Subunit: 342 residues, 2 copies
């Protein structure tokens, strides 16, 4: 029970990856997803209390902890193709706000725009910083974890054709990582084993599953509403299979409709004027090469009226069953009063 799954982007718990990349990344202390995004060596921006523990596995499900771990080229492209109306093959390139500074990258995109390549610049907390929609007297401010921007020009001045937003869902873990991260620290410095791996696992409590959908729903329901409209191309939510299972509860376990393509959809999409997406990805796919690529397991097109109806109409309908938790709640009360009886 309870173990660190990845250490600096490389597996450790079920399979212990020790490749030419995994050797150096661990020692130098580098989260590769940021380094690949930029063009320069950068560390996992977490505190030394919970350093390279970018992914964690408990009783057997993996969980996403470092939001920077979501920066997977294979996932980015996959998600962006559905947010902006792209086909499977259309040429696609991603930048990152800070890397607009060097001439080499700019020459590349100029050459790319000329031949019709979809150039997308992304903005993220530790990269180019993240961006927010303005407050209004009738609507609130919202921040995006990822802001994807269809670049169309960078020489007269920066100009963007359209924009998408992606939201990355991370998990909390009650206690601290300091014993687990502390134990594997001395092991890594100078000098797989059942005795050694047991120490790196035994230290931390389980997931903080209390808020997995409670904190997310509103901004999701809200940001999904803005998706198909007003130079906003689409809104997506990125979640691991672990979190999707939890989500199915709050959504009264529906049945996804499997479209012609490798696509599923909540409710009827046939004529949907929004562009809302939920991407369920696998943390450990069939392959085991380099850092594990975040493959899209499920690509779900959301119907906002079904998401609201399921979450807030159909779900509490199941809670109001004639044998359900609201009918039997009075019993919990009565039993608790008994505790006080002399």
């Amino acid at each position: 029970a309870n173990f660190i799954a990845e250490f600096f982007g490389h597996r450790v718990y079920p399979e212990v990856v020790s490749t030419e990349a995994a050797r150096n990344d661990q020692a130098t202390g580098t989260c590769p997803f940021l380094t690949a995004a930029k063009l320069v060596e950068t560390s996992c921006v977490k505190a030394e209390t919970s350093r390279g523990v970018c992914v964690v596995n408990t009783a057997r499900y993996d969980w996403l902890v470092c939001p920077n771990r979501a920066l997977d080229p294979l996932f980015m492209s996959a998600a962006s193709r559905k947010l902006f109306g792209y086909g499977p093959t259309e040429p696609l390139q991603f930048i990152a706000a800070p890397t607009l500074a060097d001439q080499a990258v700019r020459d590349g995109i100029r050459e790319w725009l000329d031949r019709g390549v979809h150039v997308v610049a992304y903005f993220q907390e530790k990269l180019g910083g993240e961006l927010s929609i303005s407050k209004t007297d009738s609507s609130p401010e919202f921040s995006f974890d990822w802001t994807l921007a269809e670049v169309e020009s960078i020489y007269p001045v920066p100009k963007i054709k359209r924009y998408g937003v992606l939201e990355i869902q991370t998990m909390d873990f009650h206690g601290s990582y300091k014993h687990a991260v502390g134990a594997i620290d001395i092991a890594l410095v100078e000098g797989p084993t059942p005795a050694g791996r047991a120490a790196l696992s035994k230290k931390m409590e389980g997931p903080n599953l209390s808020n997995v959908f409670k904190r997310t729903f509103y901004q999701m329901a809200y940001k999904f509403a803005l998706s198909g409209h007003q130079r906003c191309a689409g809104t997506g939510f990125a979640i691991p299979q672990s979190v999707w299972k939890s989500w199915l509860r709050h959504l009264a376990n529906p049945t996804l409709i499997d479209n012609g393509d490798g696509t599923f959809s909540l409710g009827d999409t046939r004529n949907d004027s929004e562009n809302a997406w939920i991407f369920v990805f696998e943390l450990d796919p069939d392959t085991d090469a380099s850092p594990r690529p975040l493959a899209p397991h499920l690509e779900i097109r959301v119907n906002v009226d079904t998401l609201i109806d399921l979450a807030l109409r159909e779900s509490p309908r199941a809670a109001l069953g004639p044998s359900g938790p609201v009918a039997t709640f009075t019993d919990k009360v009565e039993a608790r009063m008994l505790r006080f009886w002399p």
Copy 2:
């Protein structure tokens, strides 16, 4: 420009309440609402860092607002009574007695219950975190766990066994702060014991109430909406009599923005309703109270000046359809956003 508004249930910023109860409660170090709820004297359960600071005042552009921070402050007999009448469908005059869960250990209290019940007095028992502990509805195949800040239980019997007819749910919204209040608490702490004489208002009070950060306005409605929508859907059904949310005027003003500034219907009585609730199946309520009404009562009574019967379908529509429509305005924040992206890119543009 941020001050401690209430110290141990007594005002400390706008006007200095120096009544007899104000002098005792603070010096003894007691949160008086827990003391009243129990039948034992009890201190504010908050840590030595953010001690008896139960309410906080901030500037917020202009006008200046009061925020609730100690959830134990909402334990106001007058409020709880006013609120519960609406949840259960009690008339304004019917006798009503409230009894905290831990006080069921006493027999003299239990003998009181038996007496009231035989007279036809409505006996409600409540379950709050520090008091009787919180209560939760259990998660199923198709629904999640929820715990209620206040579980209001309509007692039906007590002698043979505990029996309840139906239950109410009251939820209290508290405001979070950025930094610790320890610098402010510490300064007022030294002043309280090491120096007699209330009088400290200009140099003394302002400094003691300084070193304080503003409110975390980020989670004001977003963190509460689902919780609310879901619990509201349950309100008029299956032995759940009703469910209410208690929020200060300050938070309410903010809640209107998230709801696209809707106009409230005016019922015959002193209630308001959000949307048409004439044939409403649920029993959903929002209770807005003033923290500082024009009164000089030692601890300020939380008098709900607004009691709003909610239409669940209306609540959702406004929060999840109308508000995003505002955001998608002709020149709104969604249209304008593309400019923020472009302006940002310039901050990474090559120079020299």
